């Protein structure tokens, strides 16, 4: 079996940069190595078959190079929409084997994340437990931490989303602290805290209580 | 255009066999320089190689996967299925189809079907639409929040629709795994404010393979008569 290695495993690089990819395979492959482009939650996409043949539709701003061992794709200008992950793939012998991906992030400026707290539906009223929501959005980079707090001390019974991609070049995330009905309906107060390196002083808080 | 699409049940409980049939359209499957071929890629995962099968009938599997693995050809309803045999939690992935193409490898891909072994039971989602909030409503967009929560398996598909019509412009968070084993997700639609302060009705359709006809819908609107 032939071990696939790719390098670097994560990388950001900005709008127009040149990204490069190195793939090496632990035996000779000669010109048999493809690459792939899978977009989070997509299928991969064929971008490159032998190892410098463009597939039809494919950009021309993507490139391979590479014979024997040591591989290289190279995206000449990156533009937004190359945000995936992408994957080398020998097809020598069997059994044939991928690389181990490299996500290919959008290295942009900081931007302030905004912070919303979301009372529980009405409909969820008829349990025993109510969900408080608190939606975290617009912020950049991904790097967030998000607690939950009530007259001081934490809260443990809560749960985050990891950061989702959103149509701008953001993130956002929704964080959800699950109380006991009857806590919520005396009316105690609750706190979302955000820690993110584009606030001011690198935190900042919401409260959510009944009205 | 060649197009492929794969189907079989998204659940299997262990030690059972997992079957999946990917049915090829647009082209023949009967046709010598194609490979067709099975990939799966476990969550947060690479894609692992299981095998393929040419229309004569032949076949190469994985040698991991071997004694397990079966895949075969049916020639008359343009299909090849996977029968994957003794399955444990480490056969929980999204599976692929695909074809090798003469030039390379792997020039068209199957949607992708992700199934989940595992010995629990189906839990039904339950869906809650949550209004933007009042600090949101100073901005020219504004959030409606569509919150599911307490379902098993993970596959769910979650789609925004009003008067009938599809809604694009929403993003869903991927599956997050709560405290008592379920699942639970986020679908956020960004809407105009004006929209939602005239009174405009959004739904939110979410389909699982434990509610009552795969479907279930719920409203979410400033209803302004109140």
């Known amino acids: 079996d032939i071990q696939m290695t790719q390098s670097p495993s994560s990388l950001s690089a900005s709008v127009g940069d040149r990204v490069t990819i190195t793939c090496r395979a632990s035996?000779?492959?000669?010109?048999?190595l493809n690459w792939y482009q899978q977009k989070p939650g997509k299928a991969p996409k064929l971008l490159i078959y032998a190892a410098s043949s463009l597939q039809s539709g494919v950009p021309s701003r993507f490139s391979g190079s590479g014979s024997g061992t040591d591989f290289t794709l190279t995206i000449s200008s990156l533009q937004p929409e190359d945000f995936a992950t992408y994957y080398c793939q020998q097809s020598y012998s069997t059994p044939l084997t991928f690389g181990g991906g490299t996500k290919v992030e959008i290295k942009r400026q900081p931007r302030e994340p905004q912070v919303y707290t979301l009372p529980p539906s009405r409909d969820e009223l008829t349990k025993n437990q109510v969900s408080l929501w608190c939606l975290v959005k617009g912020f950049y980079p991904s790097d967030i931490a998000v607690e939950w707090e009530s007259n001081g001390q934490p809260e443990n019974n809560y749960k985050t989303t990891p950061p989702v991609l959103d149509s701008d070049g953001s993130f956002f995330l929704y964080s959800k602290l699950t109380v006991d009905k009857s806590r919520w309906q005396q009316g105690n107060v609750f706190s979302c805290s955000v820690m993110h390196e584009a606030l001011h002083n690198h935190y900042t808080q919401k409260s959510l209580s009944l009205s | 255009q060649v197009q492929l699409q794969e189907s079989g049940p998204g659940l299997v409980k262990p030690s059972e066999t997992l079957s999946l049939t990917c049915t090829v359209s647009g082209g023949s499957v009967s046709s010598g320089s194609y490979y067709w071929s099975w990939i799966r890629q476990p969550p947060g995962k690479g894609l692992e190689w299981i095998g393929y099968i040419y229309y004569s009938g032949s076949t190469n599997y994985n040698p991991s996967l071997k004694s397990r693995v079966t895949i075969s050809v049916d020639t008359s309803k343009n299909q090849f299925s996977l029968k994957l045999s003794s399955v444990t939690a480490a056969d929980t992935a999204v599976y692929y189809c695909?074809?090798?193409?003469?030039?390379?490898?792997?020039?068209?891909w199957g949607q992708g079907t992700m199934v989940t072994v595992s010995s629990a039971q189906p839990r039904e989602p339950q869906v809650y639409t949550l209004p933007p909030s009042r600090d949101e409503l100073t901005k020219n967009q504004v959030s409606l929040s569509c919150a599911v929560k307490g379902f098993y398996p993970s596959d769910i598909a979650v789609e925004w629709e009003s008067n009938g019509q599809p809604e694009n412009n929403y993003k869903t968070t991927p599956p997050v795994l709560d405290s008592d084993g379920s699942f639970f997700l986020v679908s956020k639609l960004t809407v105009d404010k004006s929209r939602w302060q005239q009174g405009n009705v959004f739904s939110c359709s979410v389909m699982h393979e434990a509610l009552h006809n795969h479907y279930t819908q719920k409203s979410l609107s400033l209803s302004p008569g109140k």
């Open positions: 695909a074809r090798e193409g003469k030039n390379g490898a792997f020039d068209i």
């Open positions: 035996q000779s492959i000669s010109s048999y």
